[PDB]
């Protein structure tokens, strides 16, 4: 569970879901995320870990 | 063993050239030639 619902979500906060948008208690983390949608704790499960990527131009 | 170059049978035009470039490690000339190639992109030492 989290710190902050869907309505009360200011700037440079966090918004990882947790749980079901159509259950009873669905919020969201709200913690010190600027410059980030997501937390730095789900920065590295949400994106590609390990970003290797290369082609020609 | 310091050199052997003098000014009347060999130049030095390789030396000289050693000193107008300002790229030293290997990934430098890489980048250098990725921008020379593919001008306004990020180079990156994979590609
Ligand atoms: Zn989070």
Redesign the interface.
């Known amino acids: 569970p989290g710190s902050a619902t869907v309505l009360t979500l200011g700037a440079h906060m966090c918004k990882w879901p947790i749980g079901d948008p159509s259950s009873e208690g669905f919020t969201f983390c709200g913690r010190r995320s600027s410059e980030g949608p997501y937390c730095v704790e789900h920065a590295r499960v949400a994106y590609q870990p390990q970003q ?1 990527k ?4 | 063993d310091v050199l052997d170059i003098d000014h009347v049978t060999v130049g030095a035009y390789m030396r000289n050239t050693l000193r107008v470039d300002k790229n030293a490690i290997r990934e430098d000339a890489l980048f250098d030639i990725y921008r020379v190639m ?1 001008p306004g ?1 990020p180079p ?1 030492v ?2």
Do not use: I, L
Request: proline share 0%.
């Open positions: 290797t290369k082609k020609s131009g | 593919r992109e990156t994979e590609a």
